[PDB]
Design an enzyme around this catalytic site. Sequence first.
Site, PDB file in Angstrom:
ATOM      1  N   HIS D  43      -8.948 -20.886  -3.357  1.00  0.00           N
ATOM      2  CA  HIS D  43      -8.176 -20.075  -4.296  1.00  0.00           C
ATOM      3  C   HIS D  43      -7.895 -20.796  -5.624  1.00  0.00           C
ATOM      4  CE1 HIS D  43      -4.581 -22.211  -2.773  1.00  0.00           C
ATOM      5  NE2 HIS D  43      -4.025 -21.889  -3.925  1.00  0.00           N
ATOM      6  N   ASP D  99      -9.846 -20.491   3.394  1.00  0.00           N
ATOM      7  CA  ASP D  99      -9.525 -20.953   2.047  1.00  0.00           C
ATOM      8  C   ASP D  99     -10.013 -22.387   1.929  1.00  0.00           C
ATOM      9  OD1 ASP D  99      -8.399 -20.737  -0.488  1.00  0.00           O
ATOM     10  OD2 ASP D  99      -6.366 -21.198   0.222  1.00  0.00           O
ATOM     11  N   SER D 205      -1.646 -27.077  -4.083  1.00  0.00           N
ATOM     12  CA  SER D 205      -2.817 -26.459  -3.437  1.00  0.00           C
ATOM     13  C   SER D 205      -4.041 -27.343  -3.476  1.00  0.00           C
ATOM     14  CB  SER D 205      -3.203 -25.133  -4.109  1.00  0.00           C
ATOM     15  OG  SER D 205      -2.321 -24.093  -3.761  1.00  0.00           O
TER      16      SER D 205
END
Lengths: 49, 49, 259, 259, 103, 103
Positions: D43, D99, D205
Amino acid sequence: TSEDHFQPFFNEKTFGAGEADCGLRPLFEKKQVQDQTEKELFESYIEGR
Amino acid sequence: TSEDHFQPFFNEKTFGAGEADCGLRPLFEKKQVQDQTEKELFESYIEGR
Amino acid sequence: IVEGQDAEVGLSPWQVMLFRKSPQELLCGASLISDRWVLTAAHCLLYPPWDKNFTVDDLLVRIGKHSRTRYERKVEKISMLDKIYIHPRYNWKENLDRDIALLKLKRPIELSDYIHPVCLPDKQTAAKLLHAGFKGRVTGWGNRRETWTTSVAEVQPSVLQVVNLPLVERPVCKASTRIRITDNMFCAGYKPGEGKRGDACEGDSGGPFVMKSPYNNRWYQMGIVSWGEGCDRDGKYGFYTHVFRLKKWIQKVIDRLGS
Amino acid sequence: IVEGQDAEVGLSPWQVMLFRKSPQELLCGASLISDRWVLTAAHCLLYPPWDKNFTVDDLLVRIGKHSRTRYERKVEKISMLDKIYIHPRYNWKENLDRDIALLKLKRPIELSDYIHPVCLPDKQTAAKLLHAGFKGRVTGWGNRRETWTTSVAEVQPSVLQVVNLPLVERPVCKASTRIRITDNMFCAGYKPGEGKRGDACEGDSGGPFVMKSPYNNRWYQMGIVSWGEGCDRDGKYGFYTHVFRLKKWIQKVIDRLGS
Amino acid sequence: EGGEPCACPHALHRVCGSDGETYSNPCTLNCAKFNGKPELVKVHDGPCEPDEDEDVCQECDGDEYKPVCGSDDITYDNNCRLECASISSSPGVELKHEGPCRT
Amino acid sequence: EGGEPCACPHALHRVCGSDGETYSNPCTLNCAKFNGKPELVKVHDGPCEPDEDEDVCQECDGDEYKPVCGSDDITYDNNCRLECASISSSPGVELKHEGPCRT
């Protein structure tokens, strides 16, 4: 005395808010009221001696 | 198993270098020095069982 | 404050109270110059001869008060300090020269009828108003007498005290003390025999010395209570930090930051 | 990282940093797995809801860092990318299922005291270490608060932050969120009233979640920081891509369809 | 005495002296020594006798019970008690979250 | 609410929300727009107020003048400056030839 407004010396971004309205007490200056001892101060500006 | 001890799972001709001795930090494991908090990890190892 | 009178509610919207966390005590006074900045006497935060050196964690600020003890839920605001700034050329070992410190509030306070900033003087105001004989006003919650608990008139005031005093002539200031006066300080008070008394006292440092300009009708902070020889002694005057003079540093600090 | 601590120097030599070219911003974290491949969360590169769909010309990778912004001449190595590989069955529409993404450096990096690879797990390690109650570690330069300050203090850290977190039982994870979990993700964090706090947060992230093996003393990367409901919330946990579960695609890309 | 000994900063930093009297600050104590009591010396910090345990939170009295949890991990019957505690019982406390403390 | 619109991927992609504040990414903005400001809307990208920029290249200070020509046809006083510009004034700039840009 002045023309536009009062003297805003500091930058609002760093200083914060307040300066423009500074020195005007909301319960006195703002309402046309005088504290019990103001006169005594103004007189000393004229007294001289 | 190979030459260090670890088991290089990837093809060196594509992966590049690093696998053989991956996970051993120059400034810590290689020098027999413990970082400040890793004490907790090994601690949780005895608690979660 | 010696020989003073109880202040009217909201007489000094800028009076701040520096409160010590442990023990919970009145430290000194101070003043609100904007929604996030407070001005005090550096000797409140740092003073080696007493082992005093406070960090943002050793104290809180109390704005909007009238009574010095009671939590005034309806008007009072409490804040914590984010950053403390003491003048680098602050001389505590010799004569309290450049006794000044700025304090940044962790969060901007909401102004009200009881919480409002005082102005800092400019060239014209400093010039026109700082004349011997002219009067200013000092406010604080400091002792009303010199020694601890003596007569029916107990030492600490119940509410905020006020007193108006005359700016004294520099030669007279110098002749009054055995200390080395400087240009970053002024003195105020009555001469003996005048039959009029009044002075700042312990608990009052940091508090403002204001004057009301007759030109724009606003209040300006000219001084900061600092030191003296006893409270209301004959022939002795009280010394205040010269605010206008040090305005270059204040600006330096406030403005030379965010960019 | 919330409730973190300043990381020592060279604590996570595999820590990479995805930097946006223009504007020059910190985007996500990432890890170094060999001298030429980097592992992040997909992402961070492709995420249609925000319109984000970066290509190799849209960013750079900064390795060896500690300070979040300063160019650290003596340690930092800046590199560009050659090819980006995002999992074909990566699901960003429903639950960020799968992901994961691999980034190939345009030129092989030169390893050093501050730049060294993490090991990927194997059946042995994945099985023995991946048990609830056990602690792993998260690192990043992501926010230290959820609430992007308008009061208290500052969000953005100055140097790399570190925090250790316990793996939680899958049922607890499933019950904690109203989102469809998957076997391709796990969750960690303290349960309310467990005494401690800590969690990943915006900007973390793609960062690694690692565990130290008592069997051979190496650091294995078990997860990739992915998503969460707020940062450091009670009863909420942090979700991390399950790396072992996807090690086959990693191998499929590196060993055959990659070069 | 002259001036130097009694030239004192006007701050409070009470201490208790050998004479069993509270002095506004050390400077206040020393200035006295050099003016009558050469035996005067500091016993301890803080006033000799404790201060009246004044009811500083009385304005909170009667407030409806609506617990709030403070950063000190102590539950308060309402905000008035929390804020009042920040200058008394728990110097500096801040509202962590509404409702009782979950610890 | 249960926080269904607060399950956000942990990546930065700052936007300026009509709140008058910088939102880490579009998702967080949206989660606040629910839990709080039902009328909050994104006005522009990038932080609402630009980031206070320090001296990123500060470590190159005092470095010897050995000019190098980068791919942007800009001469740099030395390598340190080139490297630093690649992550600032000229993203991805790389060494073309040594010495001034013969242009």
